[PDB]
């Protein structure tokens, strides 16, 4: 599944990754309601689920 980044997010912990608004990310795990695991080109980690939209 692909998600679209609606906002910029800068990583704030070791498990997070950074994304820019408009990035299309690969969604790896959306089992948590708040934090989803994504791949943003050869990095994998968590971003806030509210800040992305599934395509």
Query: CB-based contacts of 5: which residues, under 8 Å, 6+ apart?
Result: 19, 20, 21, 22, 23, 24, 25, 47, 51, 52
CA 10, 43, 36, 1 torsion: positive or negative?
A: positive
Query: CB-based contacts of 19: which residues, under 8 Å, 6+ apart?
Result: 5, 8, 9, 25, 38, 40, 47, 51
For the chain, the C-alpha Rg in angstroms (whole number) is: 9
CATH architecture of the domain 1-55 equals Roll (2.30)
**What residue spans define the domains of the chain?**
1-55
């Amino acid at each position: 599944e692909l998600v679209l980044a609606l906002y910029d997010y800068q990583e704030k912990s070791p498990r997070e990754v950074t994304m820019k608004k408009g990035d299309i990310l690969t969604l790896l795990n959306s089992t948590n309601k708040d934090w989803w695991k994504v791949e943003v080109n050869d990095r994998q980690g968590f971003v806030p689920a509210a800040y992305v939209k599934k395509l």
